[model samples]
Target: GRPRAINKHEQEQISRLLEKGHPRQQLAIIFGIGVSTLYRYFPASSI
Candidate 1:
């Protein structure tokens, strides 16, 4: 199982990346998490 990797600081970057037009699938790899996990951390509608 994956440990807690996402933090407040990472959350900010995630949003930043999302805003920059990065795909969720690629962001997941860059962030070292699963695509599903990325969506779990940040909802598509929210970000």
Candidate 2:
């Protein structure tokens, strides 16, 4: 079975990465996920 959704800490990390000028591609690769998936989790509005 799949794991539960990301927690607040993960969300904060994503937001911090975005704020650090980290591109979506870099983040996706770093997190071992897809760019689209990253976008899906961290929408533009969230940034």
Candidate 3:
């Protein structure tokens, strides 16, 4: 078993390597990720 997730400090790290530039687009997909997991992305701190 493993327990790991992304933290804000590291989330900004993604830009370090892709500093040049990139286009944005939505690659939509469908899945049953469960409603409970959604809260992890936007906590009360975001508001």
Candidate 4:
């Protein structure tokens, strides 16, 4: 499948979700993406 670009709004949502205490795995499942892909969106220090 072709990779889709994440827009600013989606990126903000991801960060907000993470901040709201959702785990990487849960976020991955919720977003229909891989856990590693979710991790890639966050900073190294955040992981």
**Which of the two, 1 or 3, has more lDDT?**
1
lDDT of each: 0.84, 0.79, 0.32, 0.79
| lDDT per residue (tens digit) for residues 2-44 in model 4 | 7564667888998988888888888777778878877778864
TM-score, each model? 0.76, 0.68, 0.25, 0.72
Using TM-score as the measure, which candidate wins?
A: 1
lDDT (Cα) of model 2: 0.79
lDDT of 4 at 17: 84
**Clash pairs for candidate 1:** none
Off by over 4 Å in 1: 1-3
Residues 1-47, model 3: lDDT tens digits: 55434445533542332243321111011223332332354333442
Worst 10 residues of 1 by lDDT: 1-10
Per-residue accuracy of model 1 over 1-47 as CA lDDT, tens digit each: 75587888998889888988899989888888888888887788885
lDDT of 2 at 25: 93
lDDT of 2 at 1: 88
- Which residue pairs collide, candidate 4? none
Q: Residue 44 of candidate 4: its Cα lDDT?
A: 48
Q: Please identify model 4 stretches exceeding 4 Å from their true place.
A: none
